[PDB]
């Protein structure tokens, strides 16, 4: 019956202003509890804070209260995180939340609906495209394209426009010290295929409006 | 804060097992506990509240029990949509606190990775900074270890990893390890090698190139 949808900026500089709302539907906006949780990349779960759809008074996560701010929208029956004064560190993926509690003195909340969520990286680089390097050298071989020091992410990779599917592997990209991803993509073909056919990996990166087409051989 | 700590981090099972999977809290909490089941990029959903009480949908083979500090969700006969990550979480105060999760992945039959070696590029040498990488593929379990070694001393720092989640088709990981030197320290050497150990592999198995070779 409840439905949660997250929306926000996708990424946020240093020292701002983070913020993102909760479209409420289906049910009663104030006759329920509504609040946010986040998840760091490599960390846990984390309860920001939960506020009472008819009054706007709630409870806030000591952690975060100084720089949180969770409010309501009546007329589009909407929740809104602010988060002030961001760093990396509050990169995450965002959730909104039902909370639910209990005559135990009442407990604290569980949480019984949550929305997809919406992630969020705080950081101060500039666009860039990617630099791509082939990666070249029994019965198989390996062969990949290293994709390295672009941003934002994604960068999409394919194999031969697409006519090489089997045994692609494209790694999760990484965040390197100088705040910019690195991944590779790799694939495995017949080591007597190499020098009578080609293969090419082509590298998609939309928000740079990049396009590299890399042929990867033997040296 | 109440600390919540779940074991183990992970756990591979079968279709048709029984798993149990255990929360543990630095103070007591009675039964306040509730346990999510997320799946990757999707809404957590509530499986469990109260310590043992079913949410609303969840099927029956789930089940939740445990008072005061230590606590288990046990899933029986595991059907192919339970492969995914569990949090269990404390709500008998605030702020409400989350363990740091278990994964339970697909179990199969163990599987040696396929080591291969990749020697920075002439166009990569020229920009002043290169990546060695290193990649371990098709293998089961996860559990890896992958060695540098640069004129045959272990070299620390400077690599970073990278793991696929298991595969679709065959259930297996695949890794990469890459090691990010400055051109300059790069031509300071000559022999390059991974070396990998693994529990389908009675020796490690170790992988090599020549500067420039």
């Known amino acids: 019956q409840v439905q949660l949808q997250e929306s926000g900026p996708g990424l946020v500089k240093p020292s701002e202003t983070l913020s993102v709302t909760c479209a409420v539907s289906?049910?009663?906006?104030?006759?329920?509890?509504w609040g946010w949780i986040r998840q760091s990349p490599g960390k846990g779960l984390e309860w920001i804070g939960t506020?009472?759809?008819?009054?706007?008074?709630?409870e806030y996560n000591p952690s975060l209260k100084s720089r949180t701010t969770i409010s309501r929208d009546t007329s589009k029956s909407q929740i809104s995180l602010e988060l002030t004064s961001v760093t990396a560190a509050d990169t995450a993926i965002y959730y909104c939340?039902?909370?639910?509690?209990?005559?135990?003195?009442?407990?604290?909340?569980?949480?019984?609906?949550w929305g997809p969520g919406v992630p969020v990286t705080v950081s101060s680089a500039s666009t860039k495209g990617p630099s791509v390097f082939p990666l070249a050298p029994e019965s198989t071989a390996a062969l990949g394209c290293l994709v390295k020091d672009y941003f934002p992410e994604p960068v999409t990779v394919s194999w031969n426009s697409g006519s090489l599917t089997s045994g692609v592997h494209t790694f999760p990209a990484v965040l390197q010290s100088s705040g910019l991803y690195s991944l590779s993509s790799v694939v495995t073909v017949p080591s007597s295929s190499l020098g009578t056919q080609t293969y090419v990996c082509n590298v998609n990166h939309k928000p740079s409006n990049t396009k590299v087409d890399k042929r990867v051989e033997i040296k | 804060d109440i600390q919540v700590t779940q074991s183990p981090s992970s756990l591979s099972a079968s279709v048709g097992d029984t798993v149990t999977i255990s929360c543990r809290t630095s103070q007591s909490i009675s039964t306040w506990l509730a346990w999510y089941q997320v799946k990757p990029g999707k809404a957590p959903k509530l499986l469990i509240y109260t310590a043992s009480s079913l949410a609303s949908g969840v099927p029956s083979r789930f089940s939740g029990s445990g008072s005061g500090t230590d606590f288990t969700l046990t899933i029986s006969s595991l059907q192919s949509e339970d492969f995914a990550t569990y949090y269990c979480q404390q709500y008998i105060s605030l702020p409400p606190t989350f363990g740091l999760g278990t994964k339970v992945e697909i179990k199969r039959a163990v599987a040696a990775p396929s080591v291969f070696i990749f020697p920075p590029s002439e166009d990569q040498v020229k920009s002043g900074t290169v990546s060695v990488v290193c990649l371990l593929n098709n293998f089961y379990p996860r559990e890896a270890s992958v060695k540098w070694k640069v004129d045959g001393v272990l070299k620390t720092g400077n690599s970073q990893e990278s793991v696929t989640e298991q595969d679709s088709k065959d259930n297996t990981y695949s890794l990469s390890s890459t090691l990010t030197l400055s051109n300059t320290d790069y031509q300071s050497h000559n022999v390059y090698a991974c070396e990998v150990t693994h529990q389908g592999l009675s020796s490690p198995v170790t992988k090599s190139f020549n500067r420039g070779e």
């Open positions: 939340s039902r909370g639910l509690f209990q005559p135990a003195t009442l407990t604290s909340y569980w949480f019984d609906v």
């Open positions: 289906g049910v009663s906006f104030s006759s329920f509890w």
């Open positions: 506020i009472y759809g008819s009054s706007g008074r709630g």
